[PDB]
Amino acid sequence: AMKVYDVTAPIYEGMPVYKNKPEKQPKRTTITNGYVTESRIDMDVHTGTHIDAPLHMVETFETIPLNDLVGPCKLFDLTHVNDRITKDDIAHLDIQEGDFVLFKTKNSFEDAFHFEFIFVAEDAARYLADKQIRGVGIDALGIERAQEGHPTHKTLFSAGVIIIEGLRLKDVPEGRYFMVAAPLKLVGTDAAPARVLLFDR
């Protein structure tokens, strides 16, 4: 029988956010009238688990398309890696054109924001871009740091790769999954919070 893995981070004031910046925190506003409670959520589009798509995918009631966010993926255990994922750490792996790959790293075993998270280095990004994968997910809130001019994002976007950031892959074994990465259906944005689920084989 099918296992469903919830690989999404929860959303609440005081949650881990990028570089611990107070302004990146979400805000909940409640209003009560008798027994009726209603609220508003005000959040960064890059909060917690989120999708970042190439600009050209979005701008109608135009939204990030689902063709690639919903389908088979491959999750690789890269918990041995230190500092950053390089081409050398991923070149021998079974990664093909059209694939959606997720990287479980040491990030998954930390609960707070850490500045020196495991990120995808330029050379690994260019390899993945040139391979023409359809997506890549990482388990830190950003897929890149310590690289002026954001070359990892830009190479992946040139090739049309969608990026998922802020996955929580701790309890997920290496293997194949059916992924449903379902972003908030917000018109016009190329970035959106998402609920990402992985299903057995």
Add this chain to the structure above:
Amino acid sequence: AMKVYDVTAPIYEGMPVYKNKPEKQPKRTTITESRIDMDVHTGTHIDAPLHMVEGGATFETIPLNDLVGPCKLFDLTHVNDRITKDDIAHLDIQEGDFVLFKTKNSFEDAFHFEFIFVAEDAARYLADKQIRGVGIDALGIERAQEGHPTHKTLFSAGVIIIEGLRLKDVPEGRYFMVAAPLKLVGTDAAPARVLLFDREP
């Protein structure tokens, strides 16, 4: 080859909102750094008991395994005004089913005050069947019923409420549903991205 139907309303400033209230509109903010400020009952969403019950269970208490799994979509587009017990008594509705009702609402783009809602007697019938959930294609599952007996009857039986479905493109029948809401903590509802597959994936 499996079809996925996205049954989620798009979110944008100017969208259909409940009773056309301008304070129910969502708000996007860019600071060139981008935010969305929205009512948790915008568009397609899941209600948490807290919405109608003071100190009621909040959103993270909704079991994700109830939101993922087989469901049944019924065509009730012939109905007028409301769905009564008499409209649904004959349908194959068992214990633990997730049932979705397509109504005249799915064929309307704007908000309508006289939307098709689930009536008190139908809510009571569903609670006694011990269904795991009900979805409707109106922004609210209830109107013109002082004291909100439909939410309450349904909440008391542990029945999950999805509102805001867009179902005009999905044929009557059996689906594997993934209703994937943002992972909000302590809220009365959460916007959900809902997808319907015509076989398990």
